[PDB]
């Protein structure tokens, strides 16, 4: 299971470039900030609703324990 024995592959090409010939942060605050947006957006419509429920039960339970002793 080494590199010369893995698969067979046809007519495709690639176009690399050196590390010492370019820059590491092309655009740091103009791409990353709109990026985090579409990510979180697309996904915080099915991660938040489950955790609202644990908050509603938490406040209903300490309220009852408190008023059963202190009238």
């Amino acid at each position: 299971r080494e590199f010369g024995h893995l698969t067979r592959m046809r007519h495709v090409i690639t176009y690399s470039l050196s590390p010492f010939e370019q820059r590491a942060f092309p655009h740091y605050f103009t791409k990353g900030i709109p990026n985090v947006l579409r990510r979180t957006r697309a996904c915080i419509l099915r991660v938040a609703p489950p955790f609202v429920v644990f908050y509603l039960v938490y406040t209903w339970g300490t309220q009852e324990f408190e008023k059963s002793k202190r009238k």
């Binding site: 590199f3 010369g4 893995l6 050196s18």
Partner: protein, 68 residues
């Protein structure tokens, strides 16, 4: 004869090509190799079937011994 003119002027005689070669020594070779080969970036071309051909980050690390 007709290519010397477009590149130097003065077609170079054979007596001159030999007194240039009388100059080279062992030390002259070591300098001119370091100036052109040591710690430089290469260009690479390849035609199939190649998967083994190593990644660019590992061809570039073979251009300097980690001792000298």
């Amino acid at each position: 004869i007709g290519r010397s003119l477009l590149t130097y002027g003065r077609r170079i005689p054979l007596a001159e090509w030999e007194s240039r070669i009388a100059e080279v020594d062992a030390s002259v070779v070591r300098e001119v190799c370091s100036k052109y080969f040591y710690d430089q970036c290469p260009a690479v071309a390849g035609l199939g079937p190649i998967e083994q051909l190593p990644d660019y980050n590992r061809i570039r690390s073979g251009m300097f011994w980690l001792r000298f």
